[PDB]
A paper describes a structure:
To understand the molecular basis underlying the superbinding characteristics of the Legionella SH2 domains, we determined the structures of L. longbeachae LeSH and the L. pneumophila RavO SH2 domain in complex with tyrosine-phosphorylated peptides by X-ray crystallography. Compared to the Src SH2 domain, LeSH is missing two β-strands (βA and βF) but contains a 45-residue insert between the strand βE and the helix αB. This extra sequence in LeSH contains a structural motif called the pancreatic polypeptide (PP)-fold, comprising an amphipathic α-helix (named herein as αEF) packed against a polyproline segment via favorable hydrophobic contacts.
We obtained crystal structures of LeSH in complex with three different pTyr ligands, including the phosphotyrosine itself, a 13-mer peptide derived from the pTyr381 site of DnaJ-A1, and another 13-mer peptide corresponding to the pTyr387 site in IL2Rβ. Apart from the pTyr residue, which assumed the same conformation in all three complexes, we were not able to detect the electron density for residues preceding the pTyr in the DnaJ-A1 peptide or any residues flanking the pTyr in the IL2Rβ peptide despite the high resolution (1.6–1.7 Å) of the complex structures obtained. This suggests that, in contrary to their important role in binding to a mammalian SH2 domain, residues C-terminal to the pTyr may not make a significant contribution in binding to a Legionella SH2 domain. Of note, the positive charge on LeSH extends well beyond the pTyr-binding pocket due to the presence of a Lys-rich face in the αEF helix. The expansive positive electrostatic potential explains the general (i.e., position-independent) preference for acidic residues by LeSH beyond the pTyr. This indicates that charge–charge interaction plays a pivotal role in the LeSH-peptide ligand interaction.
Residue numbers in the entry: 11 to 167
Write the structure that this text describes.
Amino acid sequence: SKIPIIFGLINSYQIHNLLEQHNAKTKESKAVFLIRDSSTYPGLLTISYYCQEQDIVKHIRFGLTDKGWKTAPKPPHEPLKSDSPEIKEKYTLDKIKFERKMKQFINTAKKLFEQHIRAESFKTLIMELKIHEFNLEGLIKPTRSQASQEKHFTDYV
C-alpha cells in the first residue's frame, strides 16, 4: 500500500503551494524540496525547491546514466526583448549545444528508464540528492492521487 516519493505531473501553482505549505520560504534553500516527473522530457526527474537568494522556485532535471541518476544538461538563459546582438549570437550557439547534449542525454536515460527495475537505481537518486545538498528530511512526499504512476518508481518508497 506504499506510496512512491515521486510526484506525477503537477502544475506550477501546485508546486509553489506545496513548497510554501512546507515552509520553504522560512528555511534555507534546498531544506524543503520535491521530486516530480519532468513535464518537458519524459523519463527525467525534476527537483523543485525554493531559492532564498532570488525569491523564486528553481528546478533541476535529473536523468538515468550508466552510473545512476545524474544532472541533465541545463538550458541557456531565455531570450529577453532587451537582448543585444551579442547576447542573441551567443544564445544561438548555447541553444544548439544544449539541444545536442540533451538529445544524447535523453536517449541514454530513456533506455535505462525503460529497463527492468532491479531497484538499485533508487540508491543512486539519493546519492545525487546528497551531492546537491538537498536536506533529505525536507522531502515533500506526494499523496496517493498525486504520486507518479511510472512503473520505474513503484518501489521508490
